[PDB]
């Protein structure tokens, strides 16, 4: 395993600034200096599949352009193409190129790091259990990952216990978790976008934390997935056609039949002005997660708005202003933006059907459509659920499609 | 008198019904039961506006099984020619119809919300006796008229046939219109305009059909949540007081009773 | 003079269905009407019940209007077909009608008895037959003493016993001075009990009368047959001399149809020669006489 | 050959014979009356001869057959009482319909329409017709085919005399033709004229059977002469009471004598050779009055 | 063969009822309104077409055939008929074959009219696909039909009054329609115990509506089976029809 010093660098500027010229190498790497080092395009640094490519070591690294071919695969190891320590402080990975089966950027204890523009396309053979993380982070506090493109990896941008840190505009593409959470309080997420994705946002115990603008493009079976998150801030995501699936291995979540937003043990946070679009499941709302504010949102397209197994009433408008659904059958007498009359999204029979799956075959008997009249009639029978009341008439999230 | 001779028929007559009294066990069967319902889930206004929607389903069936064939079912069957040749006149084998199909509905709905405030008083323990006897007196006292508004709407269909196969046909289509149409017509012109076809005249709507008058008199002090009242969340939108509800249905009566002699008349 | 019509002429979609019945009944006779099923006899049916007004012509039931509550108590009106209330029972239905027409209640219990109905008292009118509804049909009209009896075909659906214990029953009402009016279809036996018929068609009032006087108004055959005479082949010949039709189905069965104007010289040729069985004399009855006027009339 | 060969039958339902030893021979071209009450001894006896019912102790032989054969229900018409067709088909496609089935010519249905006197109201529905209207409707497809045996049940029920009349003389121009009919009637007097043989039974058995002159000559009924002021009433009433008769002293100038009818050639000789006969009725027992005595020789 | 001479009687009876041409003006009126909010707004509005014809073609059948043979009873034609060269199988089989043709044709009118108004408001309804699940919709409709028509003739051959077939004709429509799927949920949301609702599957092939349903939404059995689980209830309830029939 040589060091970066073992190269030929051509120094540009004479303030710990070097250059790396068009041309290929071989083997690991190491930074033991706090060395701003760029480089030309055709700098192609291959690994030959051993070892962690490009470790660095010191503070205050500016590592920019490199192109990074063929790592190691040992996650035991933790062979990862950038290798940041803890004493490695404020380092930058700027505009790489990335092609190889373990970790992109893995990182722990370090303090903030910028991995900022970084094209990370992981695998192609393995099975979505062994390809490595593309950017792994673990419990760094002040860090900012920028506008990123993971390809193909396992779990995109994994988090473990990193309290303060930003994740502004990365796309993440085929992968099997889009944004892992764990144990992050305080954290934040801007506009960023999973596409077909086993899960399209893990947010797993992790308190505090604004998750605004994000997207969510045709994503497998859970789209937005909050296990356990406490004063969090949902602003803006849009959530789109969340088919069904199965992520292959079952380790932190189960198979679904596709849900925009799966909210487990979640107690407060504020979801607002999202869009969940065209899902099986619009949102999955679970017995112990009750009681927060849920207003705002555009809840069109689903085959199912939201599953609630419960007999607890649940208000969906704090502030007099509730969501717009796309079958909310009402009107609105007096011209303001809100509806007339209050929209259950579950019947006592829409629940049958979560209880007893055997009820499907009678979903379209003429006594089910008898009995769907006979809570719209008798309101005794109809159990308390999920209701708005004062739901939105028109699209709020004019400008999420864009 | 001659109004009460031939409503003691009716009263007697009516009661053999066995049509009637199927019918009129299930709406104490079912008033019982949804206030049960409304007694285990504790609500109060979910409670009055399930028995207001059961007696719109049922206290306009009741009457007009009743009277559909009381003018076409005496004409077909020779005993109307034969009355007129009793000193009576159309005005006193109508109103004698009338009352003695009417003290039938006051009986109907006496048994049916009689026991059902006999199934809250000795199920929910501590309820208000004074608010239990009131809120139930104004369903005793308004199903009458809901159901004497649709005797009288089957006095009018009885005098313009001359079978009594048609007047089952338009006895049915009355109940079908008032009940379930009606309430399904303004809930698609309120869906496809979204509220945007008048602000202003849409409430006065439900003037135009009893079983919304009926719903809006019962629903007055227990509004509660809009879902819950579906179309009959426009009345709060209308400026009349209660006491108007209540003469707008028994103008319901008097129009359409007049109506029924002005038809029988001419028979 | 219970029923008095006079220059009535009923019309009611410009059709005019009756005109210038001058129908004034006794009272003790009973009428019969003997028209069609149709405008002619049911308007003036209507007309002596009140239920009708009567256009150009006045009817004077009982002396009085025939829509007033005081003589509309004294009427009995049989219908036609009165299947009455089949849930209600026979006591019922019959307290019912006293109660109406202001007839104390102890004339049900023995108007149920003279009518044969007692066992069927108490047994709801859906039970009942045919016969058994004319039974209670007929218990309604003998309702509170009535001056003005109108049975509109009181014996169809009916056994002969009861047929024949009705017009007995009609013969008890004709000595206590009602009038009984018989709009009737079943004209072989009525013309035995009836007063004067009043045969009416195309509206228009053709004869009135009694039986005697629609003879001697209208010349009909009379019709004596003599069957079992001795001999026959001059009997062909020996009534046909003065114009007497000798007309035979069998070895001896001479229905002569005669001219009833030489019913000395038939029967003195009938009695003079040949001895006989059994002669049966027919005068022309209310078939043959309904069969004159129709057919006078077109 | 006999139509109808009713063989010692003895119809039963539980326990009950409802119908006992009843013993018919209906001939090749008489009109026969099945006379009596509405109840199960006439109702009964006329399904035997349909194919309806079976004999539970004899048999019938209609047409020398079983009344159930398909040959034999081809040349039977029936006319039931109380018959209302269907309502919303017209008078002419309900005679159309009935052809078909009765293997009857489609040519004979517009014959048969304008013979009983349809021809107006054809092609308008069954409800707008009346009670007589419907009686014509139901004699026109008991007509059908070349029938050889008609059960007329109470066929002049609605009808005018006119019509009435027009029915016996389609009767008399049936029965000429070789078809023997069989009537259930109840309007006794009128069918006496055209009824070959009455069969009067009781609620059981069968009373009486033959024809109206054995009936009267074995049950003695007395003859109904009426006379009117052929000298004086009183002075005629006096001479039956010796002779043995009844004189009934009726009003005025009329004499109604009931005589006994084996005295009544030679009684007649006085009765026209002291008056004139210009007003009298001398009338034969007739089968009102037959059916009137025959009822209380059982019951 | 009089078994169509009794039926050209009951096609230009049954097609004259005023009572059946308002329900099947309403059928077809209802089949263009839920195909008019089911394309404007595929399986999901044949789905709603067959709960349409589940409520109404036990009500056409049952409102065609209620007064079927006792209708003919207490008109008296029933008497006179059984005299003719007939026997009591051809009047059953022609009355099945006479009304049967009626709701082959108000189908015809029902869903000739919901076709219709699919294959020309969607514009791109590949209809290669729409004659096959309509095919099956309207065949399939008329056999459900034709169960509830047999139905009819088992409840009016055993009553001897019309006021009473019409008081069984709705209880054998509530009966089949909305109370024994009601009583299905009631065995599944009050029974878990002593209830295997793996069972529940089964159970709907003994219920003619839920078979209707069961070849439009396509399950333990394939869909030959409910076919011929849906003629032996024509097959059946026609020979109990005959055999009551057989006994009056
Ligand atoms: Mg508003």
Not at chain 1, 98 to 127: H, K, L, S, Y
Not at chain 1, 149 to 160: E, K
Not at chain 1, 240 to 245: K, W
Not at chain 1, 278 to 301: P, Q
Request: proline residues 4%.
């Amino acid at each position: 395993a040589p060091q970066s010093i073992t190269t030929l660098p051509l120094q540009p500027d004479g303030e710990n600034r070097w250059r790396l010229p068009a041309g290929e190498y071989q083997g690991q790497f190491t930074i033991e200096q706090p060395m701003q080092l760029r480089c030309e395009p055709g700098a192609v640094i291959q690994s030959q599949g051993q070892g962690s490519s490009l470790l660095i070591s010191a503070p205050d690294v500016l590592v920019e352009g490199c192109t990074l071919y063929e790592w190691g695969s040992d996650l035991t190891a933790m062979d990862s193409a950038v290798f940041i320590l803890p004493a490695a402080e404020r380092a930058q990975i700027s505009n790489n190129r990335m092609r190889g089966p373990g970790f992109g950027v893995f990182v722990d204890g370090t303090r903030d790091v910028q991995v900022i523009g970084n094209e990370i396309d992981g695998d192609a053979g393995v099975r979505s259990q062994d390809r490595g993380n593309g950017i792994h982070l673990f419990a760094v506090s002040g860090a900012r990952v920028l506008h990123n493109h993971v390809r193909n990896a396992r779990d995109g941008i994994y988090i473990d216990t990193s309290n303060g840190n930003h994740l502004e505009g990365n796309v993440i593409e085929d992968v099997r978790y889009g944004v892992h959470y764990m144990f992050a309080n305080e954290n934040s997420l801007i506009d960023n976008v999973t596409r077909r994705t086993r899960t399209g946002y893990a947010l797993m115990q992790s308190r505090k934390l604004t998750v605004t603008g994000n997207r969510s493009e045709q994503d497998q079976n859970y789209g937005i997935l909050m296990n356990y998150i406490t004063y969090s801030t949902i602003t803006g995501n849009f959530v789109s056609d969340v088919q069904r699936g199965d992520t292959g291995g079952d380790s932190m979540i189960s198979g679904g039949e596709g849900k925009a937003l799966f909210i487990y043990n979640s107690l407060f946070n504020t979801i607002e002005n999202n869009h969940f679009e065209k899902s099986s499941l619009g949102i999955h709302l679970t017995a112990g997660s009750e009681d927060n504010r849920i207003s705002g949102n555009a809840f069109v397209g689903n085959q199912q708005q939201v599953k609630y197994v419960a007999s607890r009433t649940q208000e969906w408008s704090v502030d007099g202003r509730g969501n717009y659904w796309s079958d909310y059958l009402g009107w609105d007498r007096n011209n303001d933006g809100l509806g007339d009359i209050a929209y259950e999204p579950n019947d006592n029979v829409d629940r049958l059907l979560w209880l007893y799956p055997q009820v499907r075959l009678l979903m379209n008997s003429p006594s089910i459509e008898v009995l769907r009249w006979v809570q719209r009639a008798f309101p005794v029978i109809k159990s308390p659920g999920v209701q708005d009341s004062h739901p939105l008439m028109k699209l709020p999230t004019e400008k999420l499609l864009t | 008198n001659q109004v009460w001779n031939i409503a003691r028929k009716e009263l007697s007559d009516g009661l053999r019904n066995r049509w009637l009294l199927a019918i009129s066990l299930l709406f104490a069967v079912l008033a019982v039961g949804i206030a049960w319902l409304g007694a285990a889930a504790s609500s109060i206004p979910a409670t009055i506006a399930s028995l207001a929607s059961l007696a719109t389903f049922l206290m306009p069936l009741i009457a007009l099984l009743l009277a559909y064939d009381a003018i076409v079912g005496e004409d077909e069957g020779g005993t109307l020619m034969l009355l007129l040749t009793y000193p009576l006149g159309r005005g006193q084998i109508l109103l004698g119809k009338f009352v003695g199909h009417g003290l039938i509905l006051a009986l109907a709905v006496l048994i049916g919300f009689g026991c059902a405030a006999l199934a809250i008083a000795l199920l929910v323990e501590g309820v208000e006796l004074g608010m239990l006897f009131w809120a139930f007196g104004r369903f005793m006292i308004s199903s009458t008229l809901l159901g004497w508004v649709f005797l009288a709407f089957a006095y009018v269909l009885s005098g313009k046939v001359n079978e009594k196969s048609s007047a089952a046909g338009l006895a049915l289509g009355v109940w079908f219109l008032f009940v379930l149409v009606f309430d399904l017509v303004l809930l698609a012109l309120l869906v496809l305009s979204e509220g945007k076809f008048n602000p202003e005249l849409l409430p006065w709507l439900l003037l135009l059909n009893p079983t919304d008058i009926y719903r809006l008199i019962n629903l007055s002090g227990f509004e509660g949540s809009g879902s819950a009242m579906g179309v009959l969340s426009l009345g709060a939108d209308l400026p009349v007081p209660a006491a108007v509800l209540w003469l707008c249905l028994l103008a319901w009566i008097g129009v359409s009773l007049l109506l029924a002699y002005a038809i029988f008349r001419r028979r | 003079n219970a029923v008095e019509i006079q220059g009535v002429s009923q019309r009611y979609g410009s059709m005019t269905v009756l005109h210038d019945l001058n129908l004034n009944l006794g009272e003790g006779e009973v009428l019969g009407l003997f028209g069609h099923n149709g405008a002619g006899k049911t308007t003036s049916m209507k007309l002596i019940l009140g239920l009708l007004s009567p256009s150009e012509g006045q009817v004077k039931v009982l002396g009085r209007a025939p829509n007033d509550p005081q003589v509309r108590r004294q009427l009995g009106y049989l219908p036609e077909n009165v299947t009455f209330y089949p849930q209600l029972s026979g006591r019922e239905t019959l307290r019912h009608f006293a109660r109406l027409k202001g007839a104390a209640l102890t004339q049900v219990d023995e108007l149920l008895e003279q009518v044969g109905l007692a066992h069927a008292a108490d047994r709801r009118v859906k039970t009942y037959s045919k016969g058994m509804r004319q039974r209670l049909g007929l218990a309604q009209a003998l309702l509170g003493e009535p001056r003005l009896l109108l049975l509109d075909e009181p014996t169809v659906g009916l056994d002969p016993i009861a047929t024949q214990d009705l017009y007995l029953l009609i013969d008890r009402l004709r000595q206590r001075g009602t009038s009984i009016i018989l709009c009737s279809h079943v004209l072989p036996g009525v013309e035995a009990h009836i007063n004067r018929a009043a045969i009416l068609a195309k509206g228009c009032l053709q004869a009135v009368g009694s039986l005697s006087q629609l003879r001697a108004e209208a010349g009909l055959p009379v019709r004596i047959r003599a069957s079992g005479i001795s001999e026959r082949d001059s009997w062909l010949q020996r009534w046909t001399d003065a114009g007497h039709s000798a007309r035979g189905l069998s070895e001896s069965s001479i229905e002569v149809v005669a001219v009833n104007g030489h019913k000395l010289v038939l029967l003195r040729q009938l009695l003079g020669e040949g001895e006989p069985e059994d002669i049966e004399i027919h005068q022309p009855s209310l078939e043959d006489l309904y069969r004159y006027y129709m057919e006078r009339a077109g």
